[PDB]
Design a protein around this motif. Structure first.
Motif, short mmCIF file in Angstrom:
data_model
loop_
_atom_site.label_atom_id
_atom_site.label_comp_id
_atom_site.label_asym_id
_atom_site.label_seq_id
_atom_site.Cartn_x
_atom_site.Cartn_y
_atom_site.Cartn_z
N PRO A 16 0.77 -1.32 -0.45
CA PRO A 16 -0.45 -0.01 0.22
C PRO A 16 1.02 1.00 0.03
CG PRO A 16 0.55 -0.89 2.06
CD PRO A 16 0.74 -1.62 1.10
N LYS A 17 0.55 2.09 -1.36
CA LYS A 17 1.10 3.56 -0.44
C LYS A 17 2.68 2.98 -0.84
CE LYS A 17 0.15 7.11 2.13
NZ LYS A 17 0.87 6.03 3.18
N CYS A 18 2.73 2.62 -1.53
CA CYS A 18 4.19 1.79 -1.72
C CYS A 18 4.58 2.28 -3.20
CB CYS A 18 4.36 0.48 -1.95
SG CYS A 18 6.69 0.35 -1.45
N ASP A 19 5.91 3.15 -3.23
CA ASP A 19 7.12 4.21 -4.75
C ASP A 19 7.97 3.21 -4.78
OD1 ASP A 19 7.75 6.68 -5.85
OD2 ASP A 19 6.30 6.85 -5.50
N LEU A 20 7.76 1.66 -4.67
CA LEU A 20 8.48 0.95 -4.47
C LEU A 20 8.31 0.27 -6.26
CD1 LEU A 20 10.95 -0.87 -3.82
CD2 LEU A 20 9.35 -2.96 -3.08
N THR A 21 9.66 0.47 -7.06
CA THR A 21 9.31 -0.09 -8.24
C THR A 21 9.29 -1.77 -8.62
OG1 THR A 21 11.64 -0.14 -9.26
CG2 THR A 21 10.71 2.01 -8.69
N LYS A 22 8.83 -2.37 -9.50
CA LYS A 22 8.69 -3.23 -10.18
C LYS A 22 10.18 -3.60 -10.42
CE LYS A 22 7.24 -0.63 -13.05
NZ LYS A 22 7.51 -1.41 -14.74
N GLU A 23 10.81 -3.05 -10.61
CA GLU A 23 12.67 -3.82 -10.65
C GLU A 23 12.78 -4.43 -9.34
OE1 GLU A 23 15.97 -2.36 -11.18
OE2 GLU A 23 16.43 -4.35 -11.84
N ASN A 24 12.71 -3.30 -8.38
CA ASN A 24 13.67 -3.18 -6.59
C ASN A 24 12.95 -4.19 -6.69
OD1 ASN A 24 12.75 0.80 -6.90
ND2 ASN A 24 14.28 -0.39 -7.46
N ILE A 43 5.01 -9.18 -12.14
CA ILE A 43 5.20 -7.65 -11.00
C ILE A 43 4.43 -7.37 -11.32
CG2 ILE A 43 6.12 -6.14 -9.46
CD1 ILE A 43 9.00 -8.45 -9.70
N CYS A 44 3.29 -6.94 -10.62
CA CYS A 44 2.15 -5.52 -12.08
C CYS A 44 1.71 -4.44 -10.83
CB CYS A 44 0.85 -5.89 -12.37
SG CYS A 44 0.47 -5.36 -13.55
N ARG A 45 2.24 -3.39 -11.79
CA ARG A 45 1.21 -2.04 -10.53
C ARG A 45 0.78 -1.50 -10.82
NH1 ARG A 45 3.36 3.86 -12.20
NH2 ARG A 45 5.71 3.40 -12.34
N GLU A 46 -0.25 -1.38 -9.03
CA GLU A 46 -1.56 -0.65 -9.75
C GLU A 46 -1.98 0.62 -8.13
OE1 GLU A 46 -4.94 -3.19 -9.53
OE2 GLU A 46 -6.04 -2.04 -8.27
N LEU A 47 -2.11 1.87 -8.42
CA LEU A 47 -2.94 2.88 -8.06
C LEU A 47 -4.48 2.70 -7.64
CD1 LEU A 47 -0.10 2.94 -9.66
CD2 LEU A 47 -0.84 5.84 -9.81
N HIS A 48 -4.30 3.03 -6.35
CA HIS A 48 -5.46 3.03 -5.31
C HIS A 48 -6.42 4.52 -5.93
CE1 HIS A 48 -3.33 -0.56 -2.62
NE2 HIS A 48 -4.04 -0.60 -4.20
N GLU A 49 -7.58 4.16 -5.59
CA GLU A 49 -8.17 5.14 -5.72
C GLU A 49 -8.15 6.41 -4.71
OE1 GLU A 49 -10.83 2.41 -7.91
OE2 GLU A 49 -12.26 3.63 -7.50
N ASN A 50 -7.66 5.59 -3.92
CA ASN A 50 -7.16 6.48 -2.45
C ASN A 50 -6.09 7.47 -3.20
OD1 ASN A 50 -8.79 4.99 -1.54
ND2 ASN A 50 -8.05 6.42 0.52
N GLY A 51 -5.17 7.39 -4.40
CA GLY A 51 -4.19 8.80 -4.76
C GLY A 51 -2.82 7.71 -4.24
N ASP A 106 1.68 -3.51 -18.66
CA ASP A 106 2.69 -2.71 -17.98
C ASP A 106 3.06 -3.01 -17.13
OD1 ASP A 106 1.98 -0.73 -19.46
OD2 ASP A 106 0.50 -0.26 -17.65
N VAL A 107 3.61 -5.04 -17.17
CA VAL A 107 3.91 -5.41 -16.57
C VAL A 107 5.41 -6.25 -16.17
CG1 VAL A 107 1.59 -6.68 -17.01
CG2 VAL A 107 3.73 -8.31 -15.25
N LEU A 108 6.23 -6.48 -15.65
CA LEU A 108 7.44 -7.17 -15.46
C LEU A 108 7.31 -8.67 -14.90
CD1 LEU A 108 10.61 -6.38 -13.26
CD2 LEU A 108 9.84 -8.70 -14.54
N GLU A 109 7.99 -9.55 -16.02
CA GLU A 109 7.87 -11.19 -16.86
C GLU A 109 9.08 -11.55 -16.04
OE1 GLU A 109 5.49 -8.67 -18.75
OE2 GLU A 109 4.44 -10.66 -20.23
N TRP A 110 8.78 -12.38 -15.40
CA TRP A 110 9.91 -13.07 -15.08
C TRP A 110 9.89 -14.19 -14.80
CZ3 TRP A 110 11.93 -16.73 -11.66
CH2 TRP A 110 13.23 -16.68 -11.27
N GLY A 111 10.77 -15.48 -15.55
CA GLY A 111 10.89 -16.50 -15.00
C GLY A 111 9.35 -17.35 -15.58
N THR A 112 9.39 -18.82 -16.33
CA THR A 112 8.36 -18.83 -16.41
C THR A 112 7.65 -19.98 -15.88
OG1 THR A 112 9.40 -19.29 -18.47
CG2 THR A 112 8.23 -21.06 -18.22
#
Length: 118
Positions: A16-24, A43-51, A106-112
């Protein structure tokens, strides 16, 4: 009385309210060891309606992993001296993961990924 002990093959991390990137998170998660084995990583990023910026993670191990410690998925900011405690969730589903996996964008794909059995 009891302790937090999760046992599942699928695990979902919520930041929640994490500015952490998918890369990190990808690097940290990818560098994150396990008692089992890391197969696929979504790893997929999603923004809440709470901003508030939220992050989603979906990993699947070859074997049922025991997440009885919220210290392994402990992700911190490599740019800021701030630590984040993600919420571990066990997917009671199996293939349902594939359904969500299809939901790309807009997501990061790793592994199979590999569904054992049909």
């Amino acid at each position: 009385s009891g302790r937090f002990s999760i046992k599942a093959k699928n695990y979902f991390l919520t930041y929640p309210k994490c500015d952490l990137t998918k890369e990190n998170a990808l690097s940290q998660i990818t560098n994150l060891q396990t008692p089992t084995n890391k197969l696929f990583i979504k790893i997929c990023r999603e923004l809440h309606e709470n901003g508030e910026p939220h992050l989603h993670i979906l990993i699947q191990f070859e074997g049922k992993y025991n997440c009885t410690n919220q210290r392994f998925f402990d992700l911190v900011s490599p740019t800021r001296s701030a630590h984040f405690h993600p919420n571990i969730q066990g997917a009671k589903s199996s293939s349902d993961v594939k359904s969500y996996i299809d939901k790309d964008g807009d997501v990061l794909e790793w592994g199979t990924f590999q569904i054992d059995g049909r």
